[PDB]
Input
Amino acid sequence: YRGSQFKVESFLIRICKSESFILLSPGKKDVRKQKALECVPLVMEPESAFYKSPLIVLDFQSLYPSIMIGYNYCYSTMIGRVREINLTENNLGVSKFSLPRNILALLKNDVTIAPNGVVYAKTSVRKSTLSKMLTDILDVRVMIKKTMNEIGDDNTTLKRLLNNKQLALKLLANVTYGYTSASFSGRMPCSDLADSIVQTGRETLEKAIDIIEKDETWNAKVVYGDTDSLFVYLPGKTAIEAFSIGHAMAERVTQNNPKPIF
Amino acid sequence: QGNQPCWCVGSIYCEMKYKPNTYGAPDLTKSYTDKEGGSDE
Amino acid sequence: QFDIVRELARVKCQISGIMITGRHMINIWRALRSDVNLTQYTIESAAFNILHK
Amino acid sequence: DYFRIQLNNQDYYMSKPTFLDPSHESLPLNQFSQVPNIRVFGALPTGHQVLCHVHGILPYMFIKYDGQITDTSTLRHQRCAQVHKTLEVKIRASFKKLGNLNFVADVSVVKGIPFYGYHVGWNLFYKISLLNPSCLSRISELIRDGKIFGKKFEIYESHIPYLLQWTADFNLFGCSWINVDRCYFRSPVLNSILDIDKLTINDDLQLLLDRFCDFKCNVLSRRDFPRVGNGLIEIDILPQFIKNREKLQHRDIHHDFLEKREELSLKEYKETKRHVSGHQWQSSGEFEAFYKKAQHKTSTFDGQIPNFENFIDKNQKFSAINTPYEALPQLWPRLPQIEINN
Output
């Protein structure tokens, strides 16, 4: 019936009661008065050509789960809005909250700076709730994948359970950016958190395109940019050898990026 | 069903379908053909 | 002129077919099977689409 | 012993107070007027789709302002009197003195870190339990209107429905096997003249329910608390009676500082990257520069002691009061169905 935005609420409320956090609510008039903006992902389309040259699939397996775990841009560390930051008042997200006075100056070291300007702590002092959530989703995902790939033939006895559990975890993970969906028909939108996480996904994608464009040895040119994945066209690059260059390029981007992203 | 046998004037349509043969999915239907049709009842 | 919804319910009393109390339906109205073309996947069409029969 | 139902669809149930329903506070002498409790239509092992009335769960939500750091631990009752007095004025404002009042339950205070906000100091919020789960959204928007009270407060828990709050409490996941303790059953298998009792029963499930009663006063009386609903055998549970894993931990280093499921018995069970080292995003240098500048503008300027160990321990003279994992089992074991009255 509800479809979206709701399973992630139940799993997050399970985790944050397990870590004894206390959730908040907006009212709908307060949803419509969030100063709600959308710094959209500025992905850009390809040019009109045939692209006879073979192409590579970059295949970020998830933007928003993998960057919630990898960068800790979570719900539970929203202390930011460097533009007009003060002790008394912070109109960040859905409501208007104060901040304690020294703990941000005390937290000068532990900030990961967002590209839109909300200062977010590392996991080294926090071990964040949403980070724990999507840590659990990637851990369960790789357990399911490895057990599915290890059982052998398994002619529709346990393989059905493993693949439908796989699709259940994937159907959680694609909509966990939802409930940061930032619409009028939403509960706890937190629109500038969505701005932060998709803008750092965009700049992660630009870090992918400038590890692509500055690697002259693995010569390529970006053509199709999009959110979940990226496509370059490898100019005349003998695709049986692109079977090597895609895996080696994937190792070169995973080593560039932090640990969880594959 | 009356136990005295009457003259049962009727026409036999017991088994008539095809041993040799896919828009209408015939072979999946023809699984029912092979075993039941083979029985001569 | 009779309420069968209460007897279909596991519960005994309350004091469009959108939702039956204590129960839950499944099919096409809230739940597409494969495609964004929900009307396309009527049960005569999806007989061959997925079951191949 | 090692068995209970799975969890299908649910709904709430606007029940009048009964023995084994918790009527006992904000004002201790008054009971509630209509206690909403959860009906579960759960699936037991090997079929036997049963309906169980789970008492005890009440819709609890929090509010914005705080209990006093030292006063409310000593004396909660004048603050609770003020809260449920103002909510009684909100009952007078409802759309259609006042003992056994219809809509508001106990309003005691529960601590925690606000998930929204990142304040590591525990912050008391008054856990206003309610009695009308339909109206909680409505009266919460009446609070946000502030028609009566001079200021508008934050309503908490993302105003989730009573179903979701209930399944949040006990880790009681949908379609999931759990366990229970030695417990009390409501009634036997009814609809005996109907064909449910003849064939749909199965002998392994009476071998499952070999421990169902203690003394056969465990059955709930039909003249006071009748077996409402059609189905197989009902074993009622209190929220004290749920002997789940209950693995909603303390995780107390959420309040302290770190500087200071899904398990398979399948035989196989198969299971480092370079850091970005100054991960500039080509505009984040200006944002961290203005972060440093506004930080120096928003610093102390007196008593400069920036230690993670220091900032908890100034706050930690605040005492240990009701936690969210203490709020749930609180105030309704109440020696259940002790039945001194006949």
In short: Strands of chain A lie at 21-22, 55-57, 111-113, 119-121, 221-225, 230-233. Helices of chain A lie at 7-18, 28-31, 64-71, 123-126, 129-150, 159-173, 191-213, 242-256. The longest helix of chain A spans residues 191-213.
